Scaffold this motif. Structure first.
Motif, short mmCIF file in Angstrom:
data_model
loop_
_atom_site.label_atom_id
_atom_site.label_comp_id
_atom_site.label_asym_id
_atom_site.label_seq_id
_atom_site.Cartn_x
_atom_site.Cartn_y
_atom_site.Cartn_z
N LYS A 69 33.47 1.58 43.75
CA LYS A 69 34.44 0.54 43.44
C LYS A 69 33.79 -0.56 42.61
O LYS A 69 32.74 -1.09 42.97
CB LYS A 69 35.01 -0.06 44.72
N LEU A 70 34.44 -0.91 41.50
CA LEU A 70 33.99 -2.04 40.70
C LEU A 70 34.72 -3.30 41.11
O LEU A 70 34.10 -4.28 41.54
CB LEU A 70 34.21 -1.76 39.21
N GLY A 71 36.04 -3.28 41.00
CA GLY A 71 36.85 -4.40 41.45
C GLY A 71 36.71 -4.64 42.93
O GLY A 71 36.06 -3.90 43.67
N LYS A 72 37.33 -5.73 43.38
CA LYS A 72 37.39 -6.06 44.79
C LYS A 72 38.60 -5.46 45.49
O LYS A 72 38.55 -5.21 46.70
CB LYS A 72 37.39 -7.58 44.97
N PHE A 73 39.68 -5.22 44.75
CA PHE A 73 40.91 -4.68 45.31
C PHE A 73 41.30 -3.38 44.64
O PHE A 73 42.48 -3.05 44.54
CB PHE A 73 42.04 -5.70 45.18
N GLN A 74 40.31 -2.63 44.18
CA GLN A 74 40.54 -1.39 43.46
C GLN A 74 40.79 -0.27 44.45
O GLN A 74 39.95 0.01 45.31
CB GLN A 74 39.33 -1.07 42.57
N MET A 75 41.96 0.36 44.35
CA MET A 75 42.38 1.42 45.26
C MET A 75 42.21 2.81 44.68
O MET A 75 41.94 3.75 45.43
CB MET A 75 43.85 1.23 45.65
N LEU A 76 42.38 2.96 43.37
CA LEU A 76 42.29 4.27 42.76
C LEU A 76 40.84 4.68 42.57
O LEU A 76 39.98 3.86 42.26
CB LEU A 76 43.00 4.29 41.41
N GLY A 77 40.60 5.97 42.75
CA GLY A 77 39.34 6.58 42.38
C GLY A 77 39.60 7.70 41.39
O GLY A 77 40.73 8.15 41.18
N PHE A 78 38.52 8.14 40.76
CA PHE A 78 38.59 9.20 39.77
C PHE A 78 38.78 10.53 40.47
O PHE A 78 37.95 10.92 41.30
CB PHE A 78 37.33 9.21 38.93
N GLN A 79 39.86 11.22 40.15
CA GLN A 79 40.18 12.51 40.74
C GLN A 79 39.96 13.61 39.71
O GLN A 79 40.04 13.37 38.50
CB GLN A 79 41.63 12.53 41.24
#
Ligand SMILES: [Mg+2]
Lengths: 100, 50, 50, 50, 50, 333, 50, 50
Positions: free
Chosen positions: G3-13
């Motif tokens: 995670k880069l952001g603090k509220f990042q929910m998506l990951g690379f699929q």
């Protein structure tokens, strides 16, 4: 009162589906409440899984033979849909024999 | 229903028409079978008999 | 059966994706009651005076 | 209690099953302060398949 | 007889726009909800006040 | 459920009571703190992410502070008791059909104007004992109500025999007279059911109804046959589905307000309310006022929810703490 | 991988083979459509404006 | 018949206010026996406190 699909019989005479009352339009909705849904540009498809002869189209020689056997097949598909916006604009009282 | 009654029907259709339909909009067309038309006739008859 | 169905209209879409329509209802409301207390916060039973 | 009532309100009429509604906000013609407010709602939706 | 109304609003609601994730709806005198295209919140409070 | 805010509310869950700001380890853990001067009060709450502290309460600008026992928040389910009018006829008359109308006032919409009618009927017979009438009518009512053609559970049907007089015999669309073997049935009970609840989309709502009767000709005159007597409720929906939605709402005052309007681009919010658990509630109102010309008040609410065993233990300790810490006198519920 | 952001929910699929609607719906490429002509006003006789 | 405002329900169906028999305008008066009173210029006062 079609005696083919309606196979349950009422003791007081006939097909128990005739003893069935349906108010399909309780009011005027100003918009169709029941309609047959269809898809645009992606309706029925048709193809043939045949070998050397095709009676359907009448073709005698096949450049692209699906199989060796001297046979022809025909496949069709269709997508359907039907919507009823609010069943609250529909009244129907039905005999219990037709229930479960 | 096990026994069709016009009493129950007139109640339901009126109550419905009251809460949802104008007096000029309470016409109800019923689609049914010939045997249902006879059940309907029989009950309307039993009714006026009263 | 063809006649039954052909009595209804038909509407086109663009795909086999689930569709959804909006449903707007009614506004006027009427609030129930939970209880009532006297000036001293004591609740009034039904066997009680004004 | 408005409306000139002097005897009060029976205990009944102030019970679990009792429903109310808004009439108005009456105010003085001398040195009148503020009263009242407004209210809102929101709709829903429906779905189908193929 | 005299009647008064009031209603409070925050400045942030100025020129404010609504993300129409569900239709924004007014309440009519009849009691029916009516869908509205408007995106301003002030549009709706203005309606409810009058 | 969206609610009314005087101008703001805030909710903190008292899942555990800690004596110090140091003992805050697990989420929900809460401690009330106030100077010895008893001039300002605040609550330190163990948030899931970290540690937060409520707004500061000037103990002289407090307007009202009161608890609630979660029994005033359980919506009671009103149950009627249907009987045969002993003034018309204590027993069913043979050739009369006893129809029963159930009028529903808020069916799908919000108004009383949106009303809906189910029914139940039995055509009486000779030597039909009243118990048999309540039986056959209960099945008729249940079958038309609990069928597979109802988008909501409108009503629940129960019977009662003179022997028990308190035990309610269930009657659903899956019951038959072969199962109802007693002969001393005295009435038909009719409750309202709790509708489906979704956390922040479908709020707690009910469908209120009235058993209306139709006439029967007894001698020569039309007469109602039944008595829709209202009796004391015995079944309530607990506070869970109500506090959770209040919490869901009051966490936009200090958090994410979108809550989904960008689905994958959402800020997930963790909640500490367990629907199925019952919560007492403490609610404090107060205001902030300026210095010289800013005497306009700014009223503020702070809500606290603690789970409720039968003894109101969690909220009676929480109150004792706040009282000894702020000098207030909140009544132990 | 992280995670880069603090509220990042998506990951690379990532996936390899035959692709399904489940695949395209699990990477947010499937959405129900909104039928805008389709609409439902809940039927009632509004005793308002009376 | 308004069900919102009229809360008491009759044993015979509907609101007890529908069972209310009222004769307005008994006889014939040269002038109206019932009228709405307004005032000449305008008693409608709007103001913003912001
Ligand atoms: Mg229907």
């Amino acid at each position: 009162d079609d005696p083919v699909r309606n196979k349950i019989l009422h003791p007081m005479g006939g097909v128990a589906f005739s003893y069935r009352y349906d108010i399909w339009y309780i009011g005027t909705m100003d918009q169709p409440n029941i309609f047959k849904c269809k898809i645009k540009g992606d309706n029925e498809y048709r193809g043939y899984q045949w070998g050397i002869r095709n009676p359907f189209t009448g073709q005698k020689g096949n450049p692209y033979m699906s199989f060796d056997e001297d046979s022809a097949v025909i496949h069709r598909m269709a997508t359907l849909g039907v919507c009823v916006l609010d069943p609250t604009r529909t009244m129907s009282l039905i005999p219990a024999i037709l229930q479960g | 229903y096990n026994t069709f009654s016009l009493k129950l029907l007139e109640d339901a259709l009126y109550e419905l028409s009251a809460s949802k339909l104008a007096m000029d909009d309470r016409l109800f067309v019923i689609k049914t079978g010939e045997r249902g038309a006879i059940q309907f006739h029989k009950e309307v008859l039993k009714t006026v008999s009263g | 059966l063809d006649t039954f169905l052909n009595s209804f209209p038909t509407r086109e879409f663009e795909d086999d994706n689930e569709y959804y329509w909006d449903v707007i209802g009614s506004s006027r409301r009427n609030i129930p009651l939970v209880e009532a207390r006297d000036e001293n916060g004591v609740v009034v039973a039904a066997n009680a005076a004004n | 209690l408005m409306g000139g009532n002097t005897q009060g309100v029976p205990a009944e009429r102030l019970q679990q099953g009792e429903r109310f509604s808004i009439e108005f906000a009456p105010v003085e013609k001398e040195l009148s302060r503020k009263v009242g407010d407004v209210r809102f709602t929101s709709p829903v939706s429906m779905r189908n398949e193929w | 007889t005299t009647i008064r109304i009031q209603h409070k609003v925050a400045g942030n609601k100025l020129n404010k726009k609504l993300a129409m994730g569900i239709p924004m709806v007014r309440n009519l005198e009849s009691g029916k909800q009516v869908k509205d295209t408007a995106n301003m919140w002030m549009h709706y409070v203005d309606w409810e006040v009058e | 459920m969206v609610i009314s805010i005087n101008q703001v509310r805030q909710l903190y869950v008292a899942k555990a009571l800690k004596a110090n700001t140091a003992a805050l380890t697990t989420a929900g853990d809460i401690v009330p703190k106030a100077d010895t001067a008893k001039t300002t009060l605040y609550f330190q709450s163990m948030s899931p992410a970290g540690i937060v502290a409520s707004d500061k309460i000037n103990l002289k600008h407090v307007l009202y502070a009161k608890a609630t026992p979660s029994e005033a928040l359980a919506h009671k389910l009103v149950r009627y008791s249907v009987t045969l009018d002993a003034d018309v006829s204590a027993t069913p008359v043979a050739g009369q059909n006893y129809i029963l109308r159930l009028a529903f006032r808020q069916y799908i919409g919000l108004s009383e104007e949106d009303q809906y009618f189910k029914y139940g009927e039995v055509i009486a017979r000779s030597g039909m004992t009243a118990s048999d009438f309540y039986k056959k009518m209960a099945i008729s009512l249940a079958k038309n109500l609990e069928n597979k053609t109802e988008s909501t559970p409108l009503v629940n049907i129960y019977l009662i025999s003179a022997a028990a007089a308190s035990t309610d015999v269930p009657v659903t669309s899956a019951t038959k007279e072969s199962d109802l073997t007693a002969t001393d049935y005295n009435q038909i009970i009719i409750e309202e059911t709790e509708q489906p609840w979704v956390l922040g989309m479908m709020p707690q709502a009910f469908i209120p109804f009235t058993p209306q009767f139709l006439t029967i000709t007894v001698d020569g005159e039309d007469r109602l046959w039944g008595v829709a007597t209202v009796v004391t409720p015995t079944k309530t929906v607990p506070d869970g589905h109500l506090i959770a939605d209040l919490e869901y709402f009051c966490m936009g005052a200090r958090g994410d307000i979108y809550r989904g309007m960008g689905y994958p681009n959402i800020i997930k919010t963790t909640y500490l309310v367990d629907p199925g658990a019952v919560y007492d509630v403490l609610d404090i109102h107060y205001f902030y006022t300026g210095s010289n010309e800013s005497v306009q008040k700014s009223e503020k609410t702070i809500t606290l929810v603690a789970v409720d065993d039968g003894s109101h233990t969690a909220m009676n300790a929480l109150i004792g703490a706040i009282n000894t810490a702020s000098g207030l006198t909140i009544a132990t519920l | 991988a992280g995670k880069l952001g603090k509220f990042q929910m998506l990951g690379f699929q990532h996936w390899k083979g035959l692709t399904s609607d489940n695949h395209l719906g699990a990477i947010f490429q499937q959405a129900p459509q909104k039928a805008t002509n389709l609409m439902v006003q809940l039927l009632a006789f509004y005793r308002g404006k009376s």
